[PDB]
Amino acid sequence: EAIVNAQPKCNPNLHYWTTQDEGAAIGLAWIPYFGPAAEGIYIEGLMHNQDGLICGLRQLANETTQALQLFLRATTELRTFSILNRKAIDFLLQRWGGTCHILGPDCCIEPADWTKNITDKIDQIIHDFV
Amino acid sequence: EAIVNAQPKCNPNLHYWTTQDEGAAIGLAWIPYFGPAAEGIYIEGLMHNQDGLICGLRQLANETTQALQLFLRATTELRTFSILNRKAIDFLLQRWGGTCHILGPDCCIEPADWTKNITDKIDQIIHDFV
Amino acid sequence: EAIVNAQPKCNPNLHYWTTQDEGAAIGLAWIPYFGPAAEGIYIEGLMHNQDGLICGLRQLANETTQALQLFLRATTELRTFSILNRKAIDFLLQRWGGTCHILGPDCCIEPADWTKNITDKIDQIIHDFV
């Protein structure tokens, strides 16, 4: 489904913070003893509403809440870190969880450039037929 | 291996409880503040011994214990939530962890309907040969 | 990249300890109540510097530290058990995260023994052509 922002307002710009997990450390800064404290590990950036992605993202986070809260109600884990990894596994299982029937709509195998490996190899034997 | 129930008795019916993780919530019931308490999140059902699955399941849980206890002895995690996700990964790695040699017994790729895409395409060029 | 041990010294032998997760238990030893205490769950072994793997491994662990410490700085998990499982997922996603274009350098599908299934099947119809 498409996402329809139905909020009273939308801040169209996203001034965000996150961590850089693979930081190009300078000298000893990667050593915990010498590195930044908890407050100084963040990077920042600014994103504008190109393609309406910011207003759509606000609505998406909004619409995600019901399913996320129901998932949290059903789990006994106190802190859940595994949602994205489980999504990655389900991505793979949806495509590769069974036999891949080539040309099938649910089999992600492209034999396009391989048919030209053999349709140029029709003149293998039918062209050279002295 | 097949499962042979070797227990003194078997309750052939399984009156079970579980959680519905994607619940079709009614109104505000998905909001933790308004929703059910810990005791009211469960659904119930009843399963009979069709195909002997209940008596087999009791024996399976029984026979699983040794390996499960040895796994728990070797882990340092206090609470283990990852067994099923690891099983899913190993499912994928067993089939897709290496090169898939088509027609091989360990490669789950079916080219059956794709050979008829090219065996009906023998009359491509051998039929139309004026 | 290759690994170049740049340490002051290298102990070329690895006297290691680990756990056997699938232990061939003898009798009741798998039962926690009867089994070994925390100090008696370990197996041991000895590895020599064949192919320079021990000296390389010491350097690898050394060189891994910066990236590992930066990963730990960016996570909010108190104890991280998921690095290897995430590596396995990324292994699969790198090969199977998109459409597999056969003969492509990033598609791990081998049609070698399947082309002989059809190149011996050129004499299907071109040999038997009465």
Ligand SMILES: *[C@@H]1O[C@H](CO)[C@@H](O[C@@H]2O[C@H](CO)[C@@H](O[C@@H]3O[C@H](CO[C@H]4O[C@H](CO)[C@@H](O)[C@H](O)[C@@H]4O)[C@@H](O)[C@H](O)[C@@H]3O)[C@H](O)[C@H]2NC(C)=O)[C@H](O)[C@H]1NC(C)=O
């Ligand atoms: C996702 O986005 C939705 C849209 O922004 C959010 O919807 C909000 O949902 C809550 C309920 O969960 C509503 O709060 C209720 O408000 C009503 C109406 O209050 C009105 O009453 C007076 C008198 O009639 C009226 O003059 C005012 O205009 C008030 O607005 C109360 O009766 C309820 O008791 C309850 O307080 C919000 O109104 C509703 N917003 C909108 C714009 O529909 C939703 O909460 C978001 N989800 C998350 C997880 O944040």
Ligand SMILES: *[C@@H]1O[C@H](CO)[C@@H](O[C@@H]2O[C@H](CO)[C@@H](O[C@@H]3O[C@H](CO[C@H]4O[C@H](CO)[C@@H](O)[C@H](O)[C@@H]4O)[C@@H](O)[C@H](O)[C@@H]3O)[C@H](O)[C@H]2NC(C)=O)[C@H](O)[C@H]1NC(C)=O
């Ligand atoms: C999986 O299913 C198995 C089968 O139901 C369970 O097997 C049970 O395993 C325990 C040991 O772990 C046994 O308990 C032992 O019982 C013996 C014999 O007691 C008998 O002794 C008197 C006098 O000879 C006899 O008259 C009675 O009939 C008694 O039965 C004791 O000597 C031991 O000290 C120990 O208590 C069970 O007997 C055994 N059951 C069966 C039916 O074989 C197994 O426990 C299940 N696994 C899990 C994890 O639940």
Ligand SMILES: *[C@@H]1O[C@H](CO)[C@@H](O[C@@H]2O[C@H](CO)[C@@H](O[C@@H]3O[C@H](CO[C@H]4O[C@H](CO)[C@@H](O)[C@H](O)[C@@H]4O)[C@@H](O)[C@H](O)[C@@H]3O)[C@H](O)[C@H]2NC(C)=O)[C@H](O)[C@H]1NC(C)=O
């Ligand atoms: C991975 O392996 C590397 C190589 O074994 C390790 O490199 C070590 O890194 C630390 C810094 O993190 C260095 O410690 C520094 O030492 C210098 C120099 O001390 C020298 O000074 C006197 C006077 O000049 C000299 O006579 C001596 O020979 C001393 O060696 C100090 O100035 C610093 O303050 C700091 O103490 C090590 O020297 C360095 N070792 C080598 C062999 O380069 C690295 O630590 C390993 N990584 C991990 C995570 O273990």
Ligand SMILES: CN(C)CCCN1c2ccccc2CCc2ccc(Cl)cc21
């Ligand atoms: C510039 N765009 C091409 C890529 C936008 C990246 N992006 C993203 C990706 C898909 C949909 C919405 C959004 C905008 C939100 C957001 C927030 C954080 C990060 Cl780290 C990326 C991110």
Ligand SMILES: CN(C)CCCN1c2ccccc2CCc2ccc(Cl)cc21
């Ligand atoms: C009706 N059967 C076709 C499907 C049975 C579902 N099932 C199951 C699946 C494989 C083998 C044994 C069992 C019976 C035990 C059990 C328990 C809970 C649930 Cl949520 C399903 C479940």
Ligand SMILES: CN(C)CCCN1c2ccccc2CCc2ccc(Cl)cc21
């Ligand atoms: C005998 N070698 C063929 C296999 C070595 C096994 N190995 C290993 C594998 C790849 C590279 C370095 C090392 C040596 C270190 C080490 C440590 C523990 C274990 Cl459990 C295996 C292990």
